[PDB]
Design an enzyme around this catalytic site. Structure first.
Site, PDB file in Angstrom:
ATOM      1  N   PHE A   1       0.810  -1.223   0.000  1.00 47.25           N
ATOM      2  CA  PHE A   1       0.000   0.000   0.000  1.00 47.25           C
ATOM      3  C   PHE A   1       0.847   1.279   0.000  1.00 47.25           C
ATOM      4  O   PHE A   1       0.527   2.235  -0.713  1.00 47.25           O
ATOM      5  CB  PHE A   1      -1.018   0.002   1.165  1.00 47.25           C
ATOM      6  CG  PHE A   1      -0.435   0.131   2.554  1.00 47.25           C
ATOM      7  CD1 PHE A   1      -0.054  -0.994   3.275  1.00 47.25           C
ATOM      8  CD2 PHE A   1      -0.287   1.380   3.151  1.00 47.25           C
ATOM      9  CE1 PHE A   1       0.483  -0.871   4.563  1.00 47.25           C
ATOM     10  CE2 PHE A   1       0.269   1.504   4.429  1.00 47.25           C
ATOM     11  CZ  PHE A   1       0.640   0.376   5.131  1.00 47.25           C
TER      12      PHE A   1
ATOM     13  N   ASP B   1      -7.447 -10.976   8.290  1.00 49.86           N
ATOM     14  CA  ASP B   1      -5.983 -10.820   8.372  1.00 49.86           C
ATOM     15  C   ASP B   1      -5.562 -10.774   9.831  1.00 49.86           C
ATOM     16  O   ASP B   1      -4.698  -9.997  10.216  1.00 49.86           O
ATOM     17  CB  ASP B   1      -5.493  -9.582   7.571  1.00 49.86           C
ATOM     18  CG  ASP B   1      -4.020  -9.642   7.159  1.00 49.86           C
ATOM     19  OD1 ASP B   1      -3.372 -10.705   7.372  1.00 49.86           O
ATOM     20  OD2 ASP B   1      -3.522  -8.639   6.626  1.00 49.86           O
TER      21      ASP B   1
HETATM   22  N1  LIG Z   1      -2.610   2.844  14.780  1.00 55.07           N
HETATM   23  C1  LIG Z   1      -1.385   2.479  14.711  1.00 55.07           C
HETATM   24  O1  LIG Z   1      -0.532   2.771  15.483  1.00 55.07           O
HETATM   25  C2  LIG Z   1      -1.050   1.532  13.618  1.00 55.07           C
HETATM   26  C3  LIG Z   1      -2.084   0.976  12.858  1.00 55.07           C
HETATM   27  N2  LIG Z   1      -1.756   0.117  11.912  1.00 55.07           N
HETATM   28  C4  LIG Z   1      -0.488  -0.218  11.680  1.00 55.07           C
HETATM   29  N3  LIG Z   1      -0.241  -1.118  10.722  1.00 55.07           N
HETATM   30  C5  LIG Z   1       1.068  -1.681  10.502  1.00 55.07           C
HETATM   31  C6  LIG Z   1       1.242  -2.028   9.010  1.00 55.07           C
HETATM   32  C7  LIG Z   1       2.685  -2.490   8.748  1.00 55.07           C
HETATM   33  C8  LIG Z   1       2.886  -3.781   9.568  1.00 55.07           C
HETATM   34  C9  LIG Z   1       2.698  -3.526  11.081  1.00 55.07           C
HETATM   35  C10 LIG Z   1       1.322  -2.919  11.406  1.00 55.07           C
HETATM   36  N4  LIG Z   1       0.302  -3.943  11.138  1.00 55.07           N
HETATM   37  N5  LIG Z   1       0.519   0.302  12.398  1.00 55.07           N
HETATM   38  C11 LIG Z   1       0.266   1.179  13.385  1.00 55.07           C
HETATM   39  N6  LIG Z   1       1.215   1.704  14.176  1.00 55.07           N
HETATM   40  C12 LIG Z   1       2.474   1.334  14.302  1.00 55.07           C
HETATM   41  C13 LIG Z   1       3.124   1.766  15.426  1.00 55.07           C
HETATM   42  C14 LIG Z   1       4.448   1.491  15.624  1.00 55.07           C
HETATM   43  C15 LIG Z   1       5.131   0.722  14.704  1.00 55.07           C
HETATM   44  C16 LIG Z   1       4.517   0.266  13.551  1.00 55.07           C
HETATM   45  N7  LIG Z   1       5.266  -0.506  12.745  1.00 55.07           N
HETATM   46  N8  LIG Z   1       6.423  -1.082  13.124  1.00 55.07           N
HETATM   47  C17 LIG Z   1       6.885  -1.769  12.201  1.00 55.07           C
HETATM   48  C18 LIG Z   1       5.911  -1.672  11.114  1.00 55.07           C
HETATM   49  N9  LIG Z   1       4.995  -0.922  11.520  1.00 55.07           N
HETATM   50  C19 LIG Z   1       3.166   0.593  13.352  1.00 55.07           C
END
Ligand SMILES: NC(=O)c1cnc(N[C@@H]2CCCC[C@@H]2N)nc1Nc1cccc(-n2nccn2)c1
Length: 268
Positions: A17, A124
């Site tokens: 994405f 998911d």
């Molecule tokens: N509301 C949110 O805080 C949030 C919502 N959704 C997501 N989605 C991600 C998509 C990518 C895979 C991981 C995750 N499912 N991440 C969020 N925060 C976030 C906060 C700290 C670190 C990361 N992080 N660390 C490594 C990768 N992403 C993400």
């Protein structure tokens, strides 16, 4: 749901994405730390469908959407879960106790009980999609594959794809049918990941080998230090036959009761 770009301040660094970036949104009075999904027509439609799902959900154990904004690209603005994904957190924090893991997976079951009651399928559900607000507060995120069930059916029938097969129930793979019971199977895999401190499930196996293993009635073994009651719950989530598989109301109740038994043992 439409936000003002002038009220959003984005950090240069990327959390993950496209990309996820940290930002700040000026609310009516307070300033709120946000996580922003930024796209980098199919991607736009997918983000808007995800926004449409999140708009309808209101539960303490599901990530809240603040809104959407069309600026440099389409952006989905959410509340921030500072400690990040559960799998990565546990890989870096092996001291986390069995009691603390039970508490977190119980919170995920409460969010999923709510999603089931709301007739949405997540599609998911995995430890990477559970985000930590604190070491004691988990929220479900990533609604990109989620679907609102039709009023007359308890499943979504996919037509086409790029699927997280190791988290999918047999009926998803064999019949392309996704229901709240299919999410229960994923929840069993998520529990295994959590008690394995973020280890990948079915290590070293291809998706097709996983399907073959499950068809033979074989299941992943009990993680080191995992309570037997929690391994038994994982096996109940991995009931091959959908009709006989429990729903989230039954799962949440089992987790709740076990969590109270553990809270009791700790006080003793
Ligand atoms: N509301 C949110 O805080 C949030 C919502 N959704 C997501 N989605 C991600 C998509 C990518 C895979 C991981 C995750 N499912 N991440 C969020 N925060 C976030 C906060 C700290 C670190 C990361 N992080 N660390 C490594 C990768 N992403 C993400």
């Amino acid at each position: 749901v439409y936000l003002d770009r002038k009220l959003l301040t984005l950090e240069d660094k990327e959390l993950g994405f496209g990309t996820v970036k940290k930002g700040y949104y000026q609310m009516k009075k307070v300033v709120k730390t946000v996580a922003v999904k930024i796209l980098k027509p199919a991607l736009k439609d997918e983000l808007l469908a995800e926004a449409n799902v999140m708009q309808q959900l209101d539960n303490p154990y599901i990530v809240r959407m603040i809104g959407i904004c069309e600026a440099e690209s389409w952006m989905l603005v959410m509340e921030m879960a500072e400690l990040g994904p559960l799998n990565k957190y546990l890989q870096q924090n092996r001291h986390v106790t069995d009691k603390n893991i039970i508490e977190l997976v119980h919170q995920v079951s409460m969010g999923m009980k709510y999603l089931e009651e709301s007739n949405f399928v997540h599609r998911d559900l995995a430890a990477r999609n559970v985000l930590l607000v604190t070491q004691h507060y988990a929220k479900i995120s990533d609604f990109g594959l989620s679907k609102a069930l039709r009023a007359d059916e308890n499943y979504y029938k996919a037509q086409t794809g790029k699927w997280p097969v190791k988290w999918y129930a047999p009926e998803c793979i064999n019949y392309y049918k996704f229901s709240s019971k299919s999410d229960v199977w994923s929840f069993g895999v998520l529990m295994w990941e959590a008690f394995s401190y973020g280890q990948k499930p079915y290590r070293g196996m291809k998706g097709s080998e996983v399907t073959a293993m499950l068809e033979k009635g074989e299941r992943m073994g009990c993680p080191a230090g995992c309570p037997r009651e929690m391994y038994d719950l994982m096996n109940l989530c991995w009931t091959y036959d959908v009709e006989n598989r429990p729903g989230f109301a039954a799962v949440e109740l089992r987790l709740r009761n076990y969590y109270y038994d553990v809270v009791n043992h700790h006080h003793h």
